[PDB]
């Protein structure tokens, strides 16, 4: 009967990753046999995708070969964390979506206490397609997230753009901002211990609206590794390898158009 049935012994395996893309009020959800993909977009330039594969869930059954509904992400996250944001004391989740015109059902249980949520779903609007293929990627860098987490959290937000330079030559990998105070450059050498993979065949310099890229910090903090790619269009791809509380690996992705 139910189009989508998902269950978790630990609700944080869903809520934690969703928080990393929470920079808009609403989000589009896609449920296939692979798992759940939640998409958040803004200004038709930036898009964040959270991927929670079926293997994460203790139970994940889907009927039709694609179930898509839009929802209030803020309300969803409020409900998923209804028993607190800092609990061996877990909170089980059972997620049920009947179909079009029906609300998303959430059954959360902690210590015998049961919270039942029913969130109405809106008309899904067309999800942007950034058409980002690996066969068109010019430069690619994989970094240890820990050594970049706090340096990124500090980039001057008074600046309008974040300029990313990737090059086979010095400074190899540079993040630049241009705010009121002046110029600021953050450089990572290709020989660095933070640099796990360096594949820059061509010098590329792209600029992106920093307001669009700022929420990706949330993903960076949760990630253990981060992959940075630009293509022949200048489009940016940020992929975050996230290890949840069960040691399982899920992914968050950020696309952003050039400025």
């Amino acid at each position: 009967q139910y189009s989508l049935v998902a269950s978790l012994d630990n609700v944080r395996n869903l809520s934690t990753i969703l928080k990393a893309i929470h920079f808009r009020e609403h989000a589009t959800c896609f449920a296939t046999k692979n798992g759940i993909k939640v998409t958040v977009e803004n200004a038709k330039c930036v898009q964040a995708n959270a991927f929670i594969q079926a293997g994460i869930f203790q139970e994940f059954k889907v009927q039709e070969e694609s179930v898509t509904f839009r929802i209030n992400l803020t309300v969803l996250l409020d409900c998923l964390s209804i028993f607190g944001s800092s609990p061996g004391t877990l909170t089980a989740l059972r997620m049920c979506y009947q179909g079009y015109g029906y609300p998303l059902m959430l059954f959360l249980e902690e210590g015998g206490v049961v919270t039942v949520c029913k969130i109405n779903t809106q008309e899904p609007e067309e999800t942007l397609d950034f058409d980002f293929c690996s066969t068109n990627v010019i430069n690619k860098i994989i970094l240890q997230s820990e050594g970049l987490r706090e340096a990124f959290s500090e980039l001057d937000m008074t600046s309008e753009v974040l300029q990313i330079t990737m090059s086979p030559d010095k400074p190899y990998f540079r993040l630049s901002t241009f705010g009121n105070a002046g110029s600021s450059h953050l450089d990572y050498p290709k020989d660095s211990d933070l640099m796990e993979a360096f594949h820059c065949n061509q010098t590329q310099v792209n600029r992106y609206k920093i307001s669009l890229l700022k929420p990706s910090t949330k993903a960076l903090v949760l990630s253990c590794k981060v992959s940075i790619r630009t293509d022949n269009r200048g489009f940016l791809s940020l992929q975050y390898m996230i290890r949840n509380e069960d040691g399982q690996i899920c992914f968050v992705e950020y696309y952003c158009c050039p400025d």
């Binding site: 993909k37 999800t127 690619k140 994989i142 993979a197 992959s227 992929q239 390898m241 992914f251």
Partner: peptide, 10 residues
């Protein structure tokens, strides 16, 4: 929409 295509050296 397509599932994730990881670019990590896995």
């Amino acid at each position: 929409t397509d599932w994730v295509d990881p670019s990590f050296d896995d």
